[PDB]
């Protein structure tokens, strides 16, 4: 029924400094030929407490995809620290990879992300204002959280 199947997502350049870009090698299998485009999005959850703090880091149109296995690297620039609340800067958050086909979300790959200081002084005594230039982003690549949604392939 579902025209697109997501085979795997490989998290590249992990870990990396907070300001360094996101890298993802995406594999998907096309069961049938699609006449429309497959839109991929990288969404950073700036704050667990509110959807106000979400940042679409990148969005890519892929198509017209013919039947068969396909692969691509999905790169995205780092989130904006000025849009991220202080209380959510250090610790755990979520990055999302979504795919729509005719405005309809059918796949959502989510990762837990660990933003921590590597410096002994900073990790033991974190500042009031987070120093983003010293935070390391460590994605939980071994725990991909995948959600499929029932969509219309008209």
């Amino acid at each position: 029924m579902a025209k697109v199947q997501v085979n795997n997502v490989v998290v590249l350049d992990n870990p990396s400094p907070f300001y360094n870009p996101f890298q993802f090698e995406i594999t998907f299998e096309c069961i049938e030929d699609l006449s429309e485009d497959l839109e991929w999005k990288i969404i950073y959850v700036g704050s667990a407490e509110s959807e106000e703090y979400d940042q679409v880091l990148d969005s890519v149109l892929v198509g017209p995809v013919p039947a068969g296995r396909h692969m691509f690297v999905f790169q995205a620039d780092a989130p904006n620290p000025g849009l991220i609340p202080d209380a959510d800067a250090v610790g755990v958050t979520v990055v999302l990879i979504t795919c729509t086909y005719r405005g309809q979300e059918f796949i959502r790959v989510g990762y837990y992300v660990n933003n921590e200081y590597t410096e002994t002084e900073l990790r033991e005594n974190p500042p009031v204002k987070p120093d983003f230039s010293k935070l390391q982003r460590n994605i939980l690549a071994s725990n991909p959280r995948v959600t499929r949604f029932h969509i219309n392939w008209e």
Binding site: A48, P144, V146
Partner: peptide, 24 residues
């Protein structure tokens, strides 16, 4: 971290009205 924060992050991960599994 508190439970409410893990629950909030769980919700963001799964979205709404889908089936969630670890792995592909």
């Amino acid at each position: 971290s508190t439970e409410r924060k893990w629950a909030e992050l769980a919700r963001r991960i799964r979205g709404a009205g889908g089936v969630t599994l670890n792995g592909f």
